[PDB]
Amino acid sequence: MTAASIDRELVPWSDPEFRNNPYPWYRRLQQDHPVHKLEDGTYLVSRYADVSHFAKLPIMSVEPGWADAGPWAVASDTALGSDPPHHTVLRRQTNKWFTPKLVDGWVRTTRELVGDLLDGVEAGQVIEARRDLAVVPTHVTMARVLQLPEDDADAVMEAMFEAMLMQSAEPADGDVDRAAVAFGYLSARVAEMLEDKRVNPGDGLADSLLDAARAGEITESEAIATILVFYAVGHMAIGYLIASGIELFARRPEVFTAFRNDESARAAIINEMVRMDPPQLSFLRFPTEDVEIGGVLIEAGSPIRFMIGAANRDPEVFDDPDVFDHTRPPAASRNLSFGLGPHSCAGQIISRAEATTVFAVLAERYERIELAEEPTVAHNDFARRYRKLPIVLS
Ligand code: HEM
């Protein structure tokens, strides 16, 4: 045995079966190696109590990983790659556009587009739900908040699929070059859109970010990067959650019937979907001083990968963690899928309302969702993805 063969036994990042369902390997990792140092120097932290306490500490920086991330170093000029104090100012620029009463307006776009798609079908028609119920409605919702052209969902989704390959812990040969191609496309399309906006300003979130850079609250590079990331990821993790929830309502029709029959249960159904199938499985921090976790001394500047998916199945927190149950008590009703601490997801309020909206419009019209064929997926060790989800509604 070697350190490398031990790591492959515990977390075979490239293995198709581990990509399709990592949860059996997470259970072993969490039981026997809850703070595990990989041969590359990354520490894997997988117990809920340890991720929830340590990952949000102020000593946990987000700067080093994104700064060294090649094509992804665009995130250094956003909240995702910025520490406080300037992190607070970058987040106020977007948080102020996604308060609950503003989100109630933005998700009218999601409702209108789902209603258009459903009005157009014949009875028994196969709907490709990944594009038509998840990616297009969410892309256009966010493009309309930004006040950017809304017609490019398919190329933006292809670009982001290519850009996410290199976020694997074991990128394939060529994956960093695929991300440079993808970001080259998105940066050129955003530059063309913002040149049009300079000449003809509107009053959306992209104009608010450009005004904040002109006022000196953020830099021009931070305005442009934040517009690019909200535009490009508006469809992505939220499109995965909507497709995952549609597959759950087909495989477990009694959950869709409960969603139909009890409005007061709808948030908790969605949150149980989110606990069980997080679209992002982990995230990195780099502590600014030495820190002991699980009796292991981690030196300043080491990479710590907090394993969200593994934590969300911790039987110290959730009884029968592999069973879907939307009636868990208040102390076992929350999860780490939108992160925590200052970098908790800047899309959380709009994402929960977009999923609520797509599921509510389907429940207004239909009693049952069925899979027309098995779904086609393209998961890796970092991010989950559907390629195709053909369904029939009745
Ligand atoms: C409208 C869609 C979304 C947008 C625009 C969006 C945007 C962002 C941004 C800008 C951040 C960084 C915030 C900061 O560093 O202060 C973030 C963090 C995060 N998001 Fe989202 N997000 C979206 C949907 C989702 C969904 C649906 C999930 C999972 C259910 C998700 C999971 C996460 C996680 C786990 C983080 C924390 C990453 C870290 O701490 O390093 N996001 N999101």
Automatic annotation (TrEMBL):
Heme b 1 binds at residues 87, 91, 285, 343, 345-346. The keyword Nucleotidyltransferase does not apply. Signal peptide: none annotated. Heme b 2 binds at residues 87, 91, 285, 343, 345. The keyword ATP-binding does not apply. Keywords: Heme, Iron, Metal-binding, Monooxygenase, Oxidoreductase. One of its GO terms (molecular function) is heme binding. Belongs to the cytochrome P450 family. This is Cytochrome P450-like protein XplA. The chain holds residues 159 to 552 of 552 of the full protein.
